[model samples]
Target: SVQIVYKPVDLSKVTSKCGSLGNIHHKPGGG
Candidate 1:
């Protein structure tokens, strides 16, 4: 079985407020 969840977090608003918060996945992966 599989499912697709979505975030209620507004895209344009979050983007406009924090900018990077929306695209957090794009950040380079490392430690």
Candidate 2:
């Protein structure tokens, strides 16, 4: 059996608080 782990990301907190880099990373996912 294979076990998978999942974690959900809150893009708003990451982007607004962080900055341009966050925006770049988020673009790939269209978040």
TM-score for each model: 0.15, 0.17
Predicted structure with the largest TM-score when compared to the true one: 2
lDDT over C-alpha atoms for residue 3 of model 1? 82
| Residue 15 alpha-carbon offset, candidate 2, angstroms | 24
Q: What are the RMSD figures for all models against the true structure?
A: 13.3, 14.5
Residue-wise lDDT of candidate 1 within 1-31, one digit each (tens)? 8987786564554334543555344767879
State candidate 1's TM-score. Answer: 0.15
Model 1: residue 17 alpha-carbon error in angstroms: 26
Local distance difference test, each candidate = 0.58, 0.56
Q: Which prediction has the highest lDDT against the true structure?
A: 1
Candidate 2 regions with alpha-carbon error over 4 angstroms: 8-31
